[PDB]
RNA sequence: GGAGAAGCAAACAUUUAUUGAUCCCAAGAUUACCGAAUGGAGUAAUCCAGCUAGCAAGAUGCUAGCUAUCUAUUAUUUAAAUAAUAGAGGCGAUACCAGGGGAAGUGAACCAUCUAAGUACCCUGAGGAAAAGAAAUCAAAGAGAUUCCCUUAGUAGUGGCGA
RNA sequence: GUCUGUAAUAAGCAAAAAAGUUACAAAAUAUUUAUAUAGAAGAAUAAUCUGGAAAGUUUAACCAAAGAAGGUGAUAGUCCUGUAAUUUAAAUGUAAAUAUCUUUUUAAAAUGUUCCUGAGUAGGACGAGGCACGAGAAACCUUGUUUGAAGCUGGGGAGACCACUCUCCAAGGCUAAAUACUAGAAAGCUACCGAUAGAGAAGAGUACCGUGAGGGAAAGGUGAAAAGAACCCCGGGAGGGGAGUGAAAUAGAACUGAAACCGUAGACUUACAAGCAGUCAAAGCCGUAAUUUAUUGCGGUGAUGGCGUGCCUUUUGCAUAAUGAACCUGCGAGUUAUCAUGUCUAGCAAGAUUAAAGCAUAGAAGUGCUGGAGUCGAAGCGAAAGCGAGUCUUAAAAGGGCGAUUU
RNA sequence: CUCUAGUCUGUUUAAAAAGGCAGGGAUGAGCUGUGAAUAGGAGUGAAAGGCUAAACAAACUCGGAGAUAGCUGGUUCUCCC
RNA sequence: ACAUUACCGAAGCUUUGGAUCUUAACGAAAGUUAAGAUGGUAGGGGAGCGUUCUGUAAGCCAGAGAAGUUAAGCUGGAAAGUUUGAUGGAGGUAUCAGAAGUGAGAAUGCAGGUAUGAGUAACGAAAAAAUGGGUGAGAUUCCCAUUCGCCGAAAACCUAAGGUUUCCUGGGUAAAGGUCGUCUUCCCAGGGUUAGUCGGCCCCUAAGGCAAAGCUGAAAAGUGUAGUCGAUGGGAAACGGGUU
RNA sequence: GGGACUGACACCUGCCCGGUGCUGGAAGGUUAAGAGGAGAUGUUAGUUUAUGCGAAGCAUUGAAUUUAAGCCCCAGUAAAC
RNA sequence: GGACGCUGUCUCAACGUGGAGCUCGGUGAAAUUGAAGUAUCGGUGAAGAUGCCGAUUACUUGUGGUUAGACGGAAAGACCC
RNA sequence: UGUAAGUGUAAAGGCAUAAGGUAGCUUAACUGUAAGACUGACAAGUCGAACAGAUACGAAAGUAGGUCUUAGUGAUCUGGC
């Protein structure tokens, strides 16, 4: 019904010697419509908050189980906002040549906009975590501010 | 999300054509005729795998019967004496024996006639 | 909400559900000519009954919410 | 803005550009004829003119500027008649909105009530939104205009109590 | 305050506030590094190896508020265009704020008297329509045909109607935002398409068809750069054979070039034969490898023997002389959104869970909190009142129906 | 000049209704050129259910429309119970 | 026909392996053994192969040759899978998880290409051709000459309705011409249409259309007078010859 | 002027008005809306010791009476079916 | 319906003429088609067999003719339900 | 002789203790129920001891919830009393 064209029967029902047909844009015909094709749809849904919380606890435990890949660094900040300094800090810590996720205990805009450009880096605040990033992160670097805020964030 | 890549039908057809190499006429290249002939051929292959046993046993029996035509022992009586004297040799073995070494088979027959 | 399954009103007005599955209903033949019908027959027709277990699945389809 | 440019594409010649081009943005000028087309008409892009002015004006010459209709407002005995202004005409948006008119293929396993449905379509009006709107309202709660979402709820009711 | 001057109020002038978004209307300014329509600047790689060509391999760096994306002779954060964060406006458009200007108040509370407060209107009767409500006891609203009031000591509504009580004030006119929409202009995103796909159209409402309304296709790819084959030879040309260009000239007007289909060459077989053409046995010949070497294997052909009624639909039953396909290659059919119910998984638990929506963060149609309005359970029985682990039927637990105490 | 009885050819035709033999009318209810008028439940019809753009017991185009079918056809990889 | 002793004969049974499932036992489980049970349309249940896309993946494998096609060989119980040559000249892929426009042999299916009939029917009317010369790479078909034949109320001549460069000159043979072609109404370039008297325009009206006013209709509009258009008609004017 | 049937001309065109149409006729039988409100119902100021009754107002109603055409009915008509 | 005249309508066919047909050169379709190392008879079978059984017959391959069959081709039978 | 007769009504199964014939009294041609079953797709249909109320007959025990049994029937919606 949405392909351009007329809805006239291309030829008579009987007598022509051809296969019966109703409209030119028949899904069978070339250039016609498409039967049972894709239509716009809402893929989003919201999980129960308890399940989401339990998943967060589980992934954090799974990451912290390993001593080397999970590390904690004393609070710092990049007051200059440059990228050299932050990259130096990562390349001092991280070892597994891959995704690195930094956890923060606040919204430190200077660190965030200093790290927005590193190669394989993801900066996350404590209250805005993402399970996919945590789960696939091969190096996980947290501040002790983030540790404390996570403690009262998820103890409740 | 269109999922079209047609590297599948050519694969099926290539395997079928590989197996249908020596067939007559258009049955060796056309997809439809090759598939029809191959499918009936494989069913023939199964049936005939079971039939080969019957065919070969029949051949062995006929060969034994031929090798006994000389003496006066009809081979029903030959199998008779063979069992009765408790010689558990095989139809294939006896058939091959009558060709490779006739005198051993003849001795077996002399021994059966008892 | 675009497509909530509609109940079958003519069935709602006649069927009722018990707590664990059975369906309650009012018996027929006590609505009309009643002089000829025997008294014990009428007394039994008055009291309500339960349907056979063979209709319960279809009725549960007819009354999607009740 | 700075060195090429002569569209979408070069060819092959011939000029333009550091006296700042081409190109881009803004304003302005020109803007044939038709088309609501409106001086009259007509087979749309073409004939016929009137009045004023300029071409040696002139004999079916040429170039310009006015002369259509309707509504509202006044100069009138708003009518007849002009005059004076102001605003409309048509298109777009195979979208949205308001009003007027309003089906049937179908479902009810027929079918006429009913359904499809105030949907399709047609017509008249507008707008950036439209419509509605500051209670002679709701409804048994004490709330306080209209409109749009969430729920009440597939409930209350309604129906050849059939769909 | 009919005229003049006195006790007694109004028409104008000091003293303030609102306004083009309704609430009176019309503008002009400057003013705003506000914004829209051009722009400006914009970071930091060398060597080596293979190769026609490096961006790639390898060894070392450097930039990053810029590792968004394209192009560059193969895959570029540092080669180019750009990107991040900043920023250009004489002229014009649109926005605010400021005054100019405009309009308004030139006062307020204080007690009862007569007046006013929307008329062919409210309502009634008849025929219709809109309310989810199809005349049904049918309210309410709009209306065609008719009839027709009250005037605050009043009137409307409260799902026939009446009373009491409670709420509201019609028959006048205005009003932004939340809302709906994108033909389009700018900037972007994609578990969207990659030339039978995607808009009909990568070249198009064109070709073509119809008197007309209207209907409506097909056709993308040389190379990194034309460096488009100087010249010679056959030929009328076309085309080809050399020479040149190129990494490639079976890239030379076209990448990769499959199948259907058409050939050439070689191996074996075929003119005494009745073959859904295949399968099971099988000598001879040809190719090849072993065991010293003419016998075994793997291969290709195949004299001969046994067996064998294509396939798909539809039927009690099809080789059927029932249907369907000329062949090959592409395209071509249980999907999506919601509700009902069952199962599985995950979480919590007599509790489970938010919907719309809001804030924070960044621009990154995320995910984090906030949001308990509502929904389903926790008590059932009965038409219902009503009573409740009991209730309905009846005076009767007297016996039954449905329950249950065992979630 | 206008029409088509009879017959033959044609009949995957030269022609989506013609051609060869011929036949009827041919001063009239005649033939014909150029314009104009009557439109779908309507037109027109010396009347055949004829004609209205090669299709008419209700034209064509677009839209409702992906109308509805208890009817016919089709529905794509494998294995195990 | 009646007796004696046999044999052949199926995917039945026995024997020899191998696979899955159920039950039971052993075993810590894993698994190992004992028993039986595995034809199958409609239909129900379970387990997998393969395709595309996204995350894993700024990973890994590719200019030392990636995808794709093609040849040979090999493997798994099936879908199917991976090694090596040749071609190809630039992108693909392992594990896990997710999502479908996810698998075609048939619908008198759609689209493209190519067979078959078959080098077969036909090449469009029973008016008719022949020779010589010329041109040219090439002539039954083009040009010219001499004969013959056909139409001659035409198949001739001149104007309409229509077409729109098809007209003339020079050049050309991809294609189109039912053969050939130097030819053509085909293609390319240039040239060609001169009006006071012809036909229009214009002044007139017929058939008819439109239409201020008036009248009637939910709307759009319908009737309709004054007016204005509307030739196939009525209206000022030319003939002969020559020339490209 | 319109419609129906027959179809030059010649001789003729008979019988039936029950059925169904058409024309004319109202004495009755029957009959809608509109007038007409016998009576009945709901509400309650009051009365009734109170129910019951229940004035007025406001509503829901309805018969007897009146009434046209049509039909039945009374005739005619067949070159009306 | 009958008669006369006239005739290849016929007994009864023969010969000649023109265009096709046939051969060669040039151009070059069509419907149709699961394919095909596609014989006959008596049987059998979805009840009429090129494909099955038994038997018989038949060197391989073309061309010009002829339509008995391939329930031939063409039109989702118009008759019937 | 021994039910062949007669049992309102077809036929069948029953009927001597009669379910057949006669007479007296009488209204159980009842209200609420109903364990347990038969037959059954469902909807329905059928039998039923026994219990409370209140009767009829009988001295009483007891019988009677129409008819010797099996046909004489009609769902729902709507409306009336």
CA–C1' distance A10–G209 (Å)? 39
Beta bridge partners of A122: A101
Å between CA of B63 and C1' of D64: 128
Task: Locate all alpha helices (DSSP H) within A1-156, ordered by sequence.
Answer: 49-64, 84-93, 109-115, 131-136, 144-155
Query: Beta carbon of C66 within 7 Å of strand D?
Result: yes
Q: DSSP assignment of C36-49, as one string? A: SS-HHHHHHHHS-E
Question: Gaps after which residues in chain B, C–N over 2.5 Å?
Answer: none
State the DSSP code for A94: -
Task: In whole angstroms, give the CA distance from residue B63 to residue A126.
Answer: 92
Radius of gyration of chain A (CA): 28
Distance C17 CA to D37 C1' (A): 78
Chains with ≥3 CB–CB distances under 8 Å to A: none
- List the A96 CA – D61 C1' distance (angstroms): 98
Which nucleotide shows the minimum CA-to-C1' distance to residue C29?
J75
Taking a C-beta distance cutoff of 8 angstroms, is the pair C17, C7 a contact?
no
| Residues in chain C after which the backbone breaks (C–N beyond 2.5 Å) | none
Q: Are strands A139-143 and A70-73 parallel, antiparallel or unpaired?
A: parallel
**Dihedral (C-alpha) B42, B48, B53, B59: value to the nearest 10 degrees?**
-140
Resolution in A: 2.9
Strand E contact nucleotides, protein CB < 7 Å: 63-68, 191-194, 196-201, 205, 214-218, 258-261, 276-281, 300-302, 305-307, 310-311, 327-341, 346-348, 352-355, 360-362, 364-369, 380-383, 393, 401-404
Closest Cα to residue B68, out of B82, B55, B56? B82
Region of A41 please: left (phi>0), alpha (psi -120 to 50) or beta. Answer: beta
B31/B14 Cα distance (integer angstroms): 9
Protein CA at A152 to nucleotide C1' at G222, angstroms: 86
Instruction: Give yes or no for a contact between B67 and B98, defined as CB atoms under 8 angstroms apart.
Output: yes
A47 touches strand G (CB under 7 A): no
Q: How far is residue B39's CA from residue A79's CA, in Å, rounded to a whole number?
A: 77
Those nucleotides of strand G lying less than 7 Å from any protein Cβ are: 5-11, 50-53, 55-59, 68-72, 80-81, 99-105, 107-111
Sequence-distant (6+) residues with CB within 8 A of A5 are A23, A24, A25
- State the method: cryo-EM
Q: Percent helix, strand and coil across chain A, each rounded to 5?
A: 35, 10, 55
Between β-strands C23-25 and C49-50, what pairing exists: parallel, antiparallel or unpaired? antiparallel
Contacts of A123 (CB under 8 A, 6+ apart): A101, A102, A104, A111, A112, A115, A116
Give me A45's structure tokens.
């849904």
What is the distance between the alpha carbons of residues B63 and B23, in angstroms, rounded to a whole number? 34
- C44 Cβ within 7 A of any nucleic strand J atom: yes
H helix and E strand count, chain B: 5, 0
3-state percent breakdown (helix, strand, coil) of chain C, nearest 5: 30, 10, 60
| C15 class by beta-carbon count within 10 Å (0-12 exposed, 13-18 middle, 19+ buried) | buried
Distance G243 C1' – B90 CA (angstroms): 125
Alpha carbon distance B33, B38 (integer Å)? 8
- Rounded to 5 degrees, φ, ψ at A66 are -95, 125
Q: Which residues share a beta bridge with C50?
A: C24
> Largest Cα–Cα distance of chain A, in whole Å?
88
CA distance B97 to B86: 18
Distance CA B90, CA C47 (A): 87
Residue A140's φ and ψ, nearest 5 degrees, are: -130, 110
Q: Distance (Å) from CA B2 to C1' E366?
A: 27
- Cα–Cα–Cα angle for B43, B49, B53, nearest 5°? 150
Nearest nucleotide to C5, CA against C1' atoms: E339
**CB of C44 within 7 Å of some strand D atom:** no
Question: Which DSSP helix (H) or strand (E) runs through B58?
Answer: helix B31-67
Of B78, B98, B96, give the one whose Cα is nearest residue B87.
B78
* Cα–Cα distances in angstroms (integers) from residue B29 to residues A56, B9, B17, C6, in the given order: 61, 15, 7, 59
CA dist., res. A99 & res. A134, Å (int): 10
Query: In this structure, are residues C55 and C21 in contact, taking their beta carbons and an 8 Å threshold?
Result: no
């Amino acid at each position: 019904s949405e392909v351009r064209g007329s809805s006239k029967k291309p030829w008579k029902q009987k007598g022509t010697g051809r296969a019966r047909v109703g409209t030119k844009r028949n899904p069978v015909w070339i250039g016609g419509g498409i039967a049972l094709g894709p239509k716009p749809r809402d893929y989003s849904y919201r999980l129960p908050k308890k399940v989401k919380k339990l998943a967060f606890k589980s992934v954090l435990s799974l990451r912290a189980a390993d001593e080397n890949s999970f590390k904690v660094i004393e609070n710092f900040n990049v007051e200059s906002g440059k990228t050299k300094d932050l990259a130096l800090i990562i390349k001092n810590f991280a070892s597994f040549n891959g995704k690195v996720v930094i956890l923060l205990g606040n919204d430190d805009q200077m660190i965030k906009r200093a790290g927005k450009n590193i190669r394989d880096l993801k900066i996350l605040s404590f209250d805005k975590l993402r399970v996919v990033d945590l789960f696939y992160a091969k190096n996980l670097i947290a501040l002790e501010s983030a540790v404390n805020k996570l403690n009262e964030f998820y103890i409740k | 999300a269109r999922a079209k890549n047609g590297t599948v039908h050519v694969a099926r057809r290539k395997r079928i054509l590989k197996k249908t190499k020596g067939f007559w006429g258009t049955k060796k290249s056309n997809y439809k005729k090759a598939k029809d002939t191959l499918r009936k051929g494989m069913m023939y292959a199964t049936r005939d795998r079971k039939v080969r046993k019957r065919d070969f046993r029949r051949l062995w029996i006929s060969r034994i019967s031929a090798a006994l035509s000389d003496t006066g022992v009809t081979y029903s009586r030959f199998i008779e004496g063979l069992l009765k004297s408790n010689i558990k040799i095989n139809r294939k073995i006896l058939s091959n024996l009558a060709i490779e070494d006739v005198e051993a088979f003849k001795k077996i027959v002399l021994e059966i006639r008892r | 909400m675009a497509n909530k399954m509609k109940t079958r009103k003519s069935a709602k007005k006649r069927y009722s559900f018990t707590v664990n599955g059975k369906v309650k209903y009012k018996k027929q033949n006590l609505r009309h000519i009643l002089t000829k019908k025997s008294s014990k027959r009428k007394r039994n027709l008055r009291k309500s009954g339960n349907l056979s277990c063979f209709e319960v699945k279809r009725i549960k389809t007819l009354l999607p919410y009740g």
